[PDB]
Each structure stands twice: as C-alpha cells, then as structure tokens.
CSV table of N, CA and C in Angstrom, one decimal:
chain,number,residue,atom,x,y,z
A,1106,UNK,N,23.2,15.8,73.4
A,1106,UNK,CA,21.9,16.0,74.1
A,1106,UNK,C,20.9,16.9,73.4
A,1107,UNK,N,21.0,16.8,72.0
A,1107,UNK,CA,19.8,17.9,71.0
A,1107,UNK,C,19.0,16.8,70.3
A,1108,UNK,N,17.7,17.3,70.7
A,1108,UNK,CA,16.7,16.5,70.3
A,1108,UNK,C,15.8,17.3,69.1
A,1109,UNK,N,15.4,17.6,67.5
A,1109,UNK,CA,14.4,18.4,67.4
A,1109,UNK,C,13.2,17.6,67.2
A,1110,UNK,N,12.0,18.3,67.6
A,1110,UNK,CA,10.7,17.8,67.9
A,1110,UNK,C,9.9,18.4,66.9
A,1111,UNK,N,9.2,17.8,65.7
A,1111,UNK,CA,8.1,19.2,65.3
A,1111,UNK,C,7.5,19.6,66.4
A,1112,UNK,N,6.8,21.2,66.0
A,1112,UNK,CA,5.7,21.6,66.7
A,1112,UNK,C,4.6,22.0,66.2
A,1113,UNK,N,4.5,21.8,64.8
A,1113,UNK,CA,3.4,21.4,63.8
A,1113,UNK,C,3.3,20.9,62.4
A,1114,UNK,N,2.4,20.7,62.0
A,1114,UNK,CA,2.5,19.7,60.7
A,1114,UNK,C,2.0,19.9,59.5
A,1115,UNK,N,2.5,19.9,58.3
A,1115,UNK,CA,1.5,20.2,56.8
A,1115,UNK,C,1.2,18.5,56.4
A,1116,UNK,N,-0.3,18.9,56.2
A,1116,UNK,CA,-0.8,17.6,55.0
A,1116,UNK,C,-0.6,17.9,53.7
A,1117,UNK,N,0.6,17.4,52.9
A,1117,UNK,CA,0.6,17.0,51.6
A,1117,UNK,C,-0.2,15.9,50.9
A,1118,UNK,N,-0.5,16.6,49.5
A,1118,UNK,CA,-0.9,15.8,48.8
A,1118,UNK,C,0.2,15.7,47.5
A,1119,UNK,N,0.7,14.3,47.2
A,1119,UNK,CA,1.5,14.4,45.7
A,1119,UNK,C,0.7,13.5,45.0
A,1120,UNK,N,1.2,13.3,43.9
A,1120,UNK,CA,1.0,13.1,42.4
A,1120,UNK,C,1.9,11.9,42.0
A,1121,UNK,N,1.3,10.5,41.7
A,1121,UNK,CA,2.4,9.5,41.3
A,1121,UNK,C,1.6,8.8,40.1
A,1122,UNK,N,2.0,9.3,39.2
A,1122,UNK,CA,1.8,8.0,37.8
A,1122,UNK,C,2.3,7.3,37.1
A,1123,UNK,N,1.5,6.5,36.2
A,1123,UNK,CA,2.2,5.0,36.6
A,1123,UNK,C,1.6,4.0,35.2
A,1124,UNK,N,1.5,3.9,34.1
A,1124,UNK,CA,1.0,3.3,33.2
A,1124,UNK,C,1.1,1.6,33.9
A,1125,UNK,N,-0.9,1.2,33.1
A,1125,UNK,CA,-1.3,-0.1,33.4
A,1125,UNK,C,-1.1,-0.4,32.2
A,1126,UNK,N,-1.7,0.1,30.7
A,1126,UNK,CA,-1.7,-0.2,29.6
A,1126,UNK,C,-1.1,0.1,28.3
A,1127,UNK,N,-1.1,-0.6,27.7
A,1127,UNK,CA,-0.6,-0.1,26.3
A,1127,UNK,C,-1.6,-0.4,25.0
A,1128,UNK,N,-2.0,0.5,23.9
A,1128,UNK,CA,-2.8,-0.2,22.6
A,1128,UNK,C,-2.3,-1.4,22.4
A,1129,UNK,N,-3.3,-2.2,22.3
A,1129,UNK,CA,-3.6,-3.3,21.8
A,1129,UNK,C,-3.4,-3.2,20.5
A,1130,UNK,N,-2.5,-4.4,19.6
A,1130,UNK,CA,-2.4,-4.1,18.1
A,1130,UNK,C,-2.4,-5.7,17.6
A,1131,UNK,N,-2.7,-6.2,16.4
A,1131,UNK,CA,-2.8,-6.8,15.6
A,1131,UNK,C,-2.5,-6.9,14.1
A,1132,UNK,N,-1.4,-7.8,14.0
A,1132,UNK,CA,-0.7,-7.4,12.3
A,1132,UNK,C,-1.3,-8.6,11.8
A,1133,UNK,N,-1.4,-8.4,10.3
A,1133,UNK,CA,-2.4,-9.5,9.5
A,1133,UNK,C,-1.2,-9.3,9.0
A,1134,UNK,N,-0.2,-10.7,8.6
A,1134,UNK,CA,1.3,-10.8,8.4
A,1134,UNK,C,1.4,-11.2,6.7
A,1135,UNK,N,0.2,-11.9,6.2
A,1135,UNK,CA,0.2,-12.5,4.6
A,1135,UNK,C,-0.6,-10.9,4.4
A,1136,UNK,N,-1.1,-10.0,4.4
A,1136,UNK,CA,-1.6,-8.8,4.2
A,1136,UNK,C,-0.4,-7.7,4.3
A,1137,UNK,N,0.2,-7.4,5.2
A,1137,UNK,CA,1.7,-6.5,5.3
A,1137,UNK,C,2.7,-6.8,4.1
A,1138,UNK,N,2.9,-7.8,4.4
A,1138,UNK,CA,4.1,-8.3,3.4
A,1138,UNK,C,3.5,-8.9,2.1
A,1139,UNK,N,2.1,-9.2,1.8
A,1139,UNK,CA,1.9,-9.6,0.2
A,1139,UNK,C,0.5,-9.2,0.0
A,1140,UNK,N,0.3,-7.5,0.4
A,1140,UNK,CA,-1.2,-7.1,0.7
A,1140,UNK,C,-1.4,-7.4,-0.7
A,1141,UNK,N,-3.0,-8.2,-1.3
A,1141,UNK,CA,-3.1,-8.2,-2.4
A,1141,UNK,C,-2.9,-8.8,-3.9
A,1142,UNK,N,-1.8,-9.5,-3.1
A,1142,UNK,CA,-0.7,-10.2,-4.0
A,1142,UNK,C,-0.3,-11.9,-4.2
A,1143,UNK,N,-1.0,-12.3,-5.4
A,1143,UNK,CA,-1.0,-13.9,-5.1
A,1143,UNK,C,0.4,-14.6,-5.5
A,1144,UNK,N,1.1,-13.8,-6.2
A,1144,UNK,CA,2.8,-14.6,-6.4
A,1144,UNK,C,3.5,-14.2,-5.2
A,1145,UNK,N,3.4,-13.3,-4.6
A,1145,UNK,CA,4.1,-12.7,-3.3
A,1145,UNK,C,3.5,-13.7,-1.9
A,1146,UNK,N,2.1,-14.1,-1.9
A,1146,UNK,CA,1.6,-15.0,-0.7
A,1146,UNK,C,2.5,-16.5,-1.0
A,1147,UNK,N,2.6,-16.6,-3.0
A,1147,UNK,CA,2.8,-17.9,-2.5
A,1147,UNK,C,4.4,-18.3,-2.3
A,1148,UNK,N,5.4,-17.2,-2.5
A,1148,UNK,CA,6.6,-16.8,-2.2
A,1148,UNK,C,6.5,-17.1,-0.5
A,1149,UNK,N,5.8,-16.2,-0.1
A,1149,UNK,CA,6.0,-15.8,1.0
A,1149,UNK,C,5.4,-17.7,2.1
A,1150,UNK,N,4.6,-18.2,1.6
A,1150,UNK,CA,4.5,-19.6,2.1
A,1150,UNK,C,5.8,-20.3,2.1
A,1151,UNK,N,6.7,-20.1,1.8
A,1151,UNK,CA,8.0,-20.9,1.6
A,1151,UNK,C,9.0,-20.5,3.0
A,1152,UNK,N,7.8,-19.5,4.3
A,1152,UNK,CA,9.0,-18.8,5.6
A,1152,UNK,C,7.9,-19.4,6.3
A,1153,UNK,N,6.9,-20.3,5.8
A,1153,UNK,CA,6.6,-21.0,7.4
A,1153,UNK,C,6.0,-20.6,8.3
A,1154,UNK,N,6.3,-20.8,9.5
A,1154,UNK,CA,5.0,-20.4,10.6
A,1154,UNK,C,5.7,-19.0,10.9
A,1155,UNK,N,6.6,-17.9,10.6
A,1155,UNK,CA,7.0,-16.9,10.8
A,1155,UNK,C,5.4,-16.0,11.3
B,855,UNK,N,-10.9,-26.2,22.8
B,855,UNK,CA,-11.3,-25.9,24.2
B,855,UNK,C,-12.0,-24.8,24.0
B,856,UNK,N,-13.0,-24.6,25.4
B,856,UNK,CA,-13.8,-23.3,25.1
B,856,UNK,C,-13.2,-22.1,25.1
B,857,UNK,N,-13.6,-21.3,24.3
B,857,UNK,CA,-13.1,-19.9,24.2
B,857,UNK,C,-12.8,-18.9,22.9
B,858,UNK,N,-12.2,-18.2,22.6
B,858,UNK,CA,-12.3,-16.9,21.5
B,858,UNK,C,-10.8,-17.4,20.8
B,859,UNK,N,-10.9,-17.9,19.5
B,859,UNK,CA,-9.5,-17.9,18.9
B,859,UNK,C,-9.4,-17.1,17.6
B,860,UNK,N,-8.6,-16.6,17.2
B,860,UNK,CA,-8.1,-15.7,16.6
B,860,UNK,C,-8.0,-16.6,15.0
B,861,UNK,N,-8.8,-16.6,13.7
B,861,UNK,CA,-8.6,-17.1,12.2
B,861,UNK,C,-7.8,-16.2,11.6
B,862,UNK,N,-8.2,-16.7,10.6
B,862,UNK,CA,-7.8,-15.8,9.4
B,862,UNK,C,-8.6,-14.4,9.2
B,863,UNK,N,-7.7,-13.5,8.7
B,863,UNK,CA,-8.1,-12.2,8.3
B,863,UNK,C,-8.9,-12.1,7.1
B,864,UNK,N,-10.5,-11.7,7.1
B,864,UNK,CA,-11.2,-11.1,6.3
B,864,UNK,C,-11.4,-9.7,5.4
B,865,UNK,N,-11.5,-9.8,4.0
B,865,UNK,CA,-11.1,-8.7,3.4
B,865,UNK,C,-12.3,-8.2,2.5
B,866,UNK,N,-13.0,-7.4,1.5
B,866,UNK,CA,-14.0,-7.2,1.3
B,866,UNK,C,-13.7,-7.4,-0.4
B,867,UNK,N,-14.0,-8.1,-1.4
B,867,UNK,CA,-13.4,-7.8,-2.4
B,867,UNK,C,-13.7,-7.0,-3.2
B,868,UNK,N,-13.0,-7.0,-4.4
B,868,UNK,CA,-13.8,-5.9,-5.6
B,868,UNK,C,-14.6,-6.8,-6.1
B,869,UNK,N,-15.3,-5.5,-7.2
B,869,UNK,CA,-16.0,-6.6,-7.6
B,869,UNK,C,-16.2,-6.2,-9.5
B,870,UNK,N,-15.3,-5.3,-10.0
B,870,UNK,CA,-15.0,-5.3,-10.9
B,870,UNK,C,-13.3,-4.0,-10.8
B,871,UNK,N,-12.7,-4.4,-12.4
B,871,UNK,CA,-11.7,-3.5,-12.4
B,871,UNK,C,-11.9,-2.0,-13.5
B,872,UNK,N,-11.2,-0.9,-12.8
B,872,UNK,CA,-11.3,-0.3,-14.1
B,872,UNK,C,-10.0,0.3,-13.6
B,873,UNK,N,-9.8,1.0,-15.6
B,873,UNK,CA,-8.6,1.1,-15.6
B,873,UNK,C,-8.8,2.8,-16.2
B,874,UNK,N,-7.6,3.8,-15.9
B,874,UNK,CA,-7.9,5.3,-16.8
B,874,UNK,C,-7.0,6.0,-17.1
B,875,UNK,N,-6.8,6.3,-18.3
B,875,UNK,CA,-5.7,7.4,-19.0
B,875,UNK,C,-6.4,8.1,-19.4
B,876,UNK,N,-5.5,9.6,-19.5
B,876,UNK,CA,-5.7,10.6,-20.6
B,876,UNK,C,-6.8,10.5,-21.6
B,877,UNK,N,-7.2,11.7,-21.9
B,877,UNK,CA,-7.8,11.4,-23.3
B,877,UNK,C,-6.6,11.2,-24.6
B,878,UNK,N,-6.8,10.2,-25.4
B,878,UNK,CA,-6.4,10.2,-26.3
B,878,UNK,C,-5.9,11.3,-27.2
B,879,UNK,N,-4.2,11.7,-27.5
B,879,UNK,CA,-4.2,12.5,-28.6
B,879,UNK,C,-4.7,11.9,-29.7
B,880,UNK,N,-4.0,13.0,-31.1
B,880,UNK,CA,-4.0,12.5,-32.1
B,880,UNK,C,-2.9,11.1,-32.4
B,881,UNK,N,-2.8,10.4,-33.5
B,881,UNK,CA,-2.6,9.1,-33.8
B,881,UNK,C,-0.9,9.4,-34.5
B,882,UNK,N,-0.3,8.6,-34.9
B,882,UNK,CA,0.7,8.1,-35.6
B,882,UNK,C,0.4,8.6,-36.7
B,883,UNK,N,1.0,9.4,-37.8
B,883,UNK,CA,0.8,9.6,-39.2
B,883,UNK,C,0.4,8.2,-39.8
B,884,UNK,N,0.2,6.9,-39.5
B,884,UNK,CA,0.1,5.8,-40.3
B,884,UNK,C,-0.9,6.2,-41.7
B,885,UNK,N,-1.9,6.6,-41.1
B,885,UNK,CA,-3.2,7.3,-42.0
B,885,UNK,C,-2.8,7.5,-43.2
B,886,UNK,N,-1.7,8.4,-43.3
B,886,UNK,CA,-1.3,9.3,-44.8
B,886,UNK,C,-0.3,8.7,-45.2
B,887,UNK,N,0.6,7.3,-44.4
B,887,UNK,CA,1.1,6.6,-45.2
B,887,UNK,C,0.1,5.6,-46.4
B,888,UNK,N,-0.6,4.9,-45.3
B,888,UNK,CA,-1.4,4.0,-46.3
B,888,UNK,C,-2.3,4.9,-47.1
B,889,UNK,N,-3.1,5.7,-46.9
B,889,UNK,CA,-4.2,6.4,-47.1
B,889,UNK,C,-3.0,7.8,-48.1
B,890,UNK,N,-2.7,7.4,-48.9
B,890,UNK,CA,-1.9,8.2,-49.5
B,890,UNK,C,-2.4,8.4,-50.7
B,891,UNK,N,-2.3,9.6,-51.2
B,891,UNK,CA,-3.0,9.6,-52.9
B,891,UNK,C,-1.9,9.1,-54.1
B,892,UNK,N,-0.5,9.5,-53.6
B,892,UNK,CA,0.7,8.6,-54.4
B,892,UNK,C,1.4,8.0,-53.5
B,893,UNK,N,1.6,6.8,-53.4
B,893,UNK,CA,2.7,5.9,-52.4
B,893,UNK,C,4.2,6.4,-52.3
B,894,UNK,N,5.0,6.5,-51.1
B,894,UNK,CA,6.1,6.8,-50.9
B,894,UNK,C,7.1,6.0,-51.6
B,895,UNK,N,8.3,6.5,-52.3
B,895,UNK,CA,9.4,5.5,-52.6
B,895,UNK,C,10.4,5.4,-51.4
B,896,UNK,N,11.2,4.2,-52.1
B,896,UNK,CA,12.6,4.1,-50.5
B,896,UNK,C,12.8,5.2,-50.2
B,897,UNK,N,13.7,5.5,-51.2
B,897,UNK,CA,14.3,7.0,-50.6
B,897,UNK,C,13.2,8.4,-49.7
B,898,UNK,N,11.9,8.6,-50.0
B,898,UNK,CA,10.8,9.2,-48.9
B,898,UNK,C,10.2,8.4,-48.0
B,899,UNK,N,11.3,8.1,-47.4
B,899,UNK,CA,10.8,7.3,-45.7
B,899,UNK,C,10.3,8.4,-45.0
B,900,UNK,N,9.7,8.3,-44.4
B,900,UNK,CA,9.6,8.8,-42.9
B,900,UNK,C,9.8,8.3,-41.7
B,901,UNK,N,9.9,8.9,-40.8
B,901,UNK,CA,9.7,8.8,-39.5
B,901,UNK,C,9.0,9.0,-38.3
B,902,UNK,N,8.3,8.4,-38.1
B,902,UNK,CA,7.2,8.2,-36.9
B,902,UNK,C,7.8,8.4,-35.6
B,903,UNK,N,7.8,9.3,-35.3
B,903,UNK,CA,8.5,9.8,-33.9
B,903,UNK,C,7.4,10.7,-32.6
B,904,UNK,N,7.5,10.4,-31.6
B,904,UNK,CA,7.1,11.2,-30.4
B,904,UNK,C,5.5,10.9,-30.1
C-alpha cells in the first residue's frame, strides 16, 4: 500500500548526436594506378570494367 | 536520359620537358691520351677510373 508521488519537477535539457553525412569522394582509377603512364594504362586495360 | 553523368577525367598537360643535373665536372683524361705529345706504348696503359 506505498505509492511515491513527485512533488516537483526539473526541466532537462540533453544533447544527442547523430551523423547525416560523410565527404563525398571520387577516384580517377586509370590516374591512381597508371597516373601518367601510357604502358601501365594499356596494361591496365586488360582488368576491364574494374 | 536527362540528367548529370559522370566522363572521363580531365588533366592539364605539359607543354614542354626539361631535364637537370649538376654542373658538369672535369672530363675523363681522354684529352692527354689522344692529345699527347708522345703516344703511350702497351705496357703505359692507363686507367680511366671514378
């Protein structure tokens, strides 16, 4: 037969974060792997739509 | 279809090469072989080293 009741109240405020995004990036793939290089591009033509 | 598609990667080229070493030491004794006031025999070889 124990009931407890508040008899007053605090307003909190918290703090929740929370990532929407990430950098955007872009690899130039015949540039990385044959920056420059015309026996290495035409090597590298032989892996296709990689 | 309408809309923004993604080509090939553009690159800016050269537009000439250059190339750089040291200044030049001095040369190979060749000079005071050929340029000799008496020619060497077999046995006064030299050696062109370093």
């Amino acid at each position: 037969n124990s009931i407890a009741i508040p008899t007053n109240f605090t307003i909190s405020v918290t703090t929740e974060i929370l990532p929407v995004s990430m950098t955007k990036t872009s690899v130039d793939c015949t540039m990385y792997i044959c920056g420059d290089s015309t026996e290495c591009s035409n090597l590298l033509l032989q892996y296709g739509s990689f | 279809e309408k809309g923004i598609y993604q080509t090939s990667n553009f690159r800016v080229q050269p537009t000439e090469s250059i190339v750089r070493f040291p200044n030049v030491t001095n040369l190979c004794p060749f000079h005071e072989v050929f340029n000799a006031t008496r020619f060497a025999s077999v046995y006064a070889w030299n050696r062109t080293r370093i």
